[PDB]
From a paper:
Finally, a monomer of this structure was used as a template for molecular replacement to phase the high-resolution (1.2 Å) dataset of crystal form A, which was subsequently refined to a final Rcryst of 12.4% and an Rfree of 14.9%. First, the 1.2 Å structure reveals the spatial configuration of the (Sa)[name] protein ranging from amino acid Met-1 to Glu-115; hence, it lacks 22 amino acids at the carboxy-terminus of the authentic (Sa)[name] protein. In the “open” (Sa)[name] structure, one monomer is present in the asymmetric unit. Indeed, a similar dimer configuration to the one described for the “semi-closed” (Sa)[name] structure is observed with the same monomer-monomer interactions mediated by the two β-sheets. In the “open” (Sa)[name] structure, both proline residues are visible in the electron density; however, almost directly after Pro-110, the electron density is drastically diminished caused by the flexibility of the carboxy-terminus. In the “open” structure of the (Sa)[name] protein, this interaction does not occur since Glu-115 is rotated outwards. However, this electron density fits perfectly to a water molecule and not to an iron, and the water molecule was clearly visible after the refinement at this high resolution (1.2 Å) of the “open” (Sa)[name] structure.
Each of these enzymes catalyzes as their main activity the cyclization of N-γ-acetyl-L-2,4-diaminobutyric acid (N-γ-ADABA), the reaction product of the 2,4-diaminobutyrate acetyltransferase (EctA), to ectoine with the concomitant release of a water molecule. The two crystal structures that we report here for the (Sa)[name] protein (with resolutions of 1.2 Å and 2.0 Å, respectively), and data derived from extensive site-directed mutagenesis experiments targeting evolutionarily highly conserved residues within the extended [name] protein family, provide a first view into the architecture of the catalytic core of the ectoine synthase.
Author numbering:
A (entry chain A), B (entry chain A): 1 to 115
């Protein structure tokens, strides 16, 4: 069994920061689960479009509010606690946090942490 | 893109209840992501040992307190918000919620919802 704490991971190189977000990587490919599992903070005021190519991602909103806009349809979806979105390589999206947003994220295949 | 709300799913047959827990299945195998993604409530006072055979599971604690005991080692781990555990078929564990515990859970391969 693995048992790990977010607060511990946040104090390590498994916690990464970029422009507009930070993420604590709880599980990465080398943990062997066949998916990665992250606790990701999306900062207020960012306009985020990143997607790791050749991966699928699911995102559960834990805290905070904002929007996710689907550029394929023009749909603007509310983000708030309990909203989940799922993305592939073909999605064209923009995530815009109103407040900071805390999320639980899953990638398949797993993110490696080496980019 | 998929975008779905916990409150909506909870009102459907994707929300299942058993002895000691209930789960809203956000993503199942038929959603095509290659993992399932659940929001699971573990009830206060339960002593839970279930594991779906031939699956891997990761669990992030969102709310509540309790313990997870590893019968292979005798380790008793605290459950509280931000603790993540991961299990395979070989783990021998008991989860004992003190309060109700809310979790975000990932299974690989995905749960089907047909048992």
């Amino acid at each position: 069994m693995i048992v790990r704490n977010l607060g511990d991971i946040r104090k390590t190189d498994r916690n990464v920061r970029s422009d507009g977000w930070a993420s604590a990587r709880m599980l990465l490919k080398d943990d062997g689960m066949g998916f990665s599992f992250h606790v990701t903070t999306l900062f207020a005021g960012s306009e985020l479009r990143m997607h790791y190519q050749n991966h699928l991602e699911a995102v559960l909103v834990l805290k905070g509010t904002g929007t996710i806009e689907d550029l394929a349809t023009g749909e603007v979806h509310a983000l708030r606690p309990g909203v989940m979105y799922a993305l592939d390589d073909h999605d064209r999206h923009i995530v815009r946090p109103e407040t900071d947003i805390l999320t639980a994220c899953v990638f398949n295949p797993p993110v490696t942490g080496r980019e």
